[PDB]
Amino acid sequence: CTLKSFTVEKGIYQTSNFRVQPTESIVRFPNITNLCPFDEVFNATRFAS
Amino acid sequence: EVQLVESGGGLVQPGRSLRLSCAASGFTFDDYAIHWVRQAPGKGLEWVSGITWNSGTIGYADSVKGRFTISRDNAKNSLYLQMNSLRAEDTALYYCAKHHQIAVAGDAEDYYFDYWGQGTLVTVSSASTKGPSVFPLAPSSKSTSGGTAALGCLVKDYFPEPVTVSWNSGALTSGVHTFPAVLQSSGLYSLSSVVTVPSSSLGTQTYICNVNHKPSNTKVDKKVEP
Numbered sequence: 683c684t685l686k687s688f689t690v691e692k693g694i695y696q697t698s699n700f701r702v703q704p705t706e707s708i709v710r711f712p713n714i715t716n717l718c719p720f721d722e723v724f725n726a727t728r729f730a731s
Numbered sequence: 732e733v734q735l736v737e738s739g740g741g742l743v744q745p746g747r748s749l750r751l752s753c754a755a756s757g758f759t760f761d762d763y764a765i766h767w768v769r770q771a772p773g774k775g776l777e778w779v780s781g782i783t784w785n786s787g788t789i790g791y792a793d794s795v796k797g798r799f800t801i802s803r804d805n806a807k808n809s810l811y812l813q814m815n816s817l818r819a820e821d822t823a824l825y826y827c828a829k830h831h832q833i834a835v836a837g838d839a840e841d842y843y844f845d846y847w848g849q850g851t852l853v854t855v856s857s858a859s860t861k862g863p864s865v866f867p868l869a870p871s872s873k874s875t876s877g878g879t880a881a882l883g884c885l886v887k888d889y890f891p892e893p894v895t896v897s898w899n900s901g902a903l904t905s906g907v908h909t910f911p912a913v914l915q916s917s918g919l920y921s922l923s924s925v926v927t928v929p930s931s932s933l934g935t936q937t938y939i940c941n942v943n944h945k946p947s948n949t950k951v952d953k954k955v956e957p
């Protein structure tokens with residue numbers, strides 16, 4: 683294909699390029715910390731009006 | 732630190748309305764509950780209403796429902812209390828008390844006051860406001876000891892009693908015996924004060940008795956002379 687013919691002579695030719703390909707989609711983010719005050723606004727005791 | 736200054740209060744006719752305020756200063760007006768509690772003269776205290784750290788009503792008493800409405804303003808850091816249809820049994824010193832705990836989310840309802848203020852005398856009657864009458868009590872020349880001579884003021888003819896006496900600028904916290912007022916069988920009251928007043932040799936106070944009365948706003952700056 684890269685040397686279009688049907689009687690290619692003797693020699694070495696560069697045709698392709700290998701490439702080992704992935705096997706996961708690892709995503710690494712840090713730890714959760716200092717959660718927002720959503721526990722005292724959705725689980726409060728009393729509202730006003 | 733905490734300065735719970737209270738504004739709004741005076742003589743109003745029975746059946747009218749007024750707005751009370753309590754400007755907070757010193758802490759964060761987003762995590763401490765502030766309530767309203769009245770105190771009749773020499774007849775104990777009485778809780779009116781209260782609001783938690785957020786905008787939330789915690790209830791009223793058994794005699795103020797439907798007439799009183801409390802509101803909280805976290806933006807201006809001030810708690811307001813509306814009073815409608817005031818009657819004769821609403822004359823007391825309404826205080827502005829805070830709460831000690833931070834009122835976490837999951838706990839038990841338990842409110843107890845930690846910081847108190849001064850209160851505003853909210854008197855409700857049919858009488859009218861009268862103008863005070865300051866008089867320069869003569870510091871007579873009776874001289875036996877060092878500071879035996881004393882001068883003061885003779886404020887009288889005033890129905891409400893939000894009386895605050897000053898001498899120079901709101902200072903001189905030394906011995907000043909401000910005698911309480913008394914109803915002289917006519918609704919009016921009478922104020923007087925006594926200072927040390929040492930030997931007068933052009934080295935004494937400015938001889939000024941500033942009397943501030945909110946329902947009868949008038950700046951009296953009369954001097955006292957022997």
Ligand SMILES: *[C@@H]1O[C@H](CO)[C@@H](O)[C@H](O)[C@H]1NC(C)=O
Pocket residue numbers: 720721724725837
């Ligand atoms: C409210 O409290 C319950 C029990 O503590 C908890 O399961 C829930 O996650 C809380 N809700 C919020 C919005 O945090």
